[PDB]
Amino acid sequence: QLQEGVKQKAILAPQQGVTRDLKGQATALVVNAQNKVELRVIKADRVIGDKW
Amino acid sequence: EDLSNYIVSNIQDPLSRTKGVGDFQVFGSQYSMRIWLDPAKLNSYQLTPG
């Protein structure tokens, strides 16, 4: 298990927070400033522990 | 095709429950895991698509 690189601002989202759409793209829900829920399609590539 | 998958996946099963609907014909069809081979990168590893 090689290790390369280090990120400074890496955003680690939990596994229960990001799921799969029916097309296959990884989606995760976001609440807004006016307190409504909203969907944005993300690019989840690696897992670290139990966090995408 | 995304919307046709949505139809065939989960508004096709409750639609034939109703009294009177016989056979029907959805436009398009469902998904497929469609694999896009790259010919230069098939060249790069000595692979035919077979």
From Swiss-Prot, chain A:
Subcellular localization: Cell inner membrane
Bridged cysteine pairs (disulfide): none
Induction conditions: By growth under severe iron limitation.
Gene deletion effect: Disruption of MexA, MexB and OprM significantly reduces active efflux of N-(3-oxododecanoyl) homoserine lactone/3-oxo-C12-HSL/PAI-1, but not N-butyryl homoserine lactone/C4-HSL/PAI-2.
Outcome, altering residue 20 to A/D: Abolishes complex formation and thereby decreases drug resistance
Quaternary data: Component of the MexAB-OprM multidrug efflux complex, composed of six MexA subunits forming a hexameric tube, binding to a MexB trimer, which interact with the trimeric OprM outer membrane channel protein. OprM is thought to not directly contact MexB; instead, MexA joins MexB and OprM by forming a funnel-like hexamer anchored to the inner membrane. MexA may initially form a hexameric ring complex with MexB prior to OprM, then OprM undergoes a conformational change as it contacts MexA, allowing the periplasmic gate to open.
Additional comment: In both X-ray crystal structures approximately the last 100 residues are not ordered.
Family statement drawn from the similarity comment of this UniProt entry: Belongs to the membrane fusion protein (MFP) (TC 8.A.1) family.
Function: The periplasmic linker component of the MexAB-OprM efflux system that confers multidrug resistance. Functions as the major efflux pump for n-hexane and p-xylene efflux. Has been shown in one study to be involved in the active efflux of the autoinducer N-(3-oxododecanoyl) homoserine lactone, thereby playing an indirect role in quorum-sensing; but has been shown in another study not to be involved in efflux of this autoinducer. Over-expression of the pump increases antibiotic and solvent efflux capacities. Implicated in the secretion of the siderophore pyoverdine.
Protein name: Multidrug resistance protein MexA
Name of the gene encoding the protein in the UniProt record: mexA
Residue window of the full protein shown: 281 to 332 of 383
From Swiss-Prot, chain B:
Subunit comment: Component of the MexAB-OprM multidrug efflux complex, composed of six MexA subunits forming a hexameric tube, binding to a MexB trimer, which interact with the trimeric OprM outer membrane channel protein. OprM is thought to not directly contact MexB; instead, MexA joins MexB and OprM by forming a funnel-like hexamer anchored to the inner membrane. MexA may initially form a hexameric ring complex with MexB prior to OprM, then OprM undergoes a conformational change as it contacts MexA, allowing the periplasmic gate to open.
Subcellular location: Cell inner membrane
Mutant phenotype after disruption: Disruption of MexA, MexB and OprM significantly reduces active efflux of N-(3-oxododecanoyl) homoserine lactone/3-oxo-C12-HSL/PAI-1, but not N-butyryl homoserine lactone/C4-HSL/PAI-2.
Family recorded in the similarity comment: Belongs to the resistance-nodulation-cell division (RND) (TC 2.A.6) family.
Positions in coiled-coil regions: none
Additional notes on this entry: Pyridopyrimidine derivatives, such as ABI-PP, are not exported by the MexAB-OprM efflux pump, bind tightly to a MexB hydrophobic pocket and so potentiate the activities of antibiotics such as erythromycin.
Record's protein name: Multidrug resistance protein MexB
Species: Pseudomonas aeruginosa (strain ATCC 15692 / DSM 22644 / CIP 104116 / JCM 14847 / LMG 12228 / 1C / PRS 101 / PAO1)
Swiss-Prot/TrEMBL induction comment: By growth under severe iron limitation.
Role this protein plays: The inner membrane transporter component of the MexAB-OprM efflux system that confers multidrug resistance. Functions as the major efflux pump for n-hexane and p-xylene efflux. Has been shown in one study to be involved in the active efflux of the autoinducer N-(3-oxododecanoyl) homoserine lactone, thereby playing an indirect role in quorum-sensing; but has been shown in another study not to be involved in efflux of this autoinducer. Over-expression of the pump increases antibiotic and solvent efflux capacities. Implicated in the secretion of the siderophore pyoverdine.
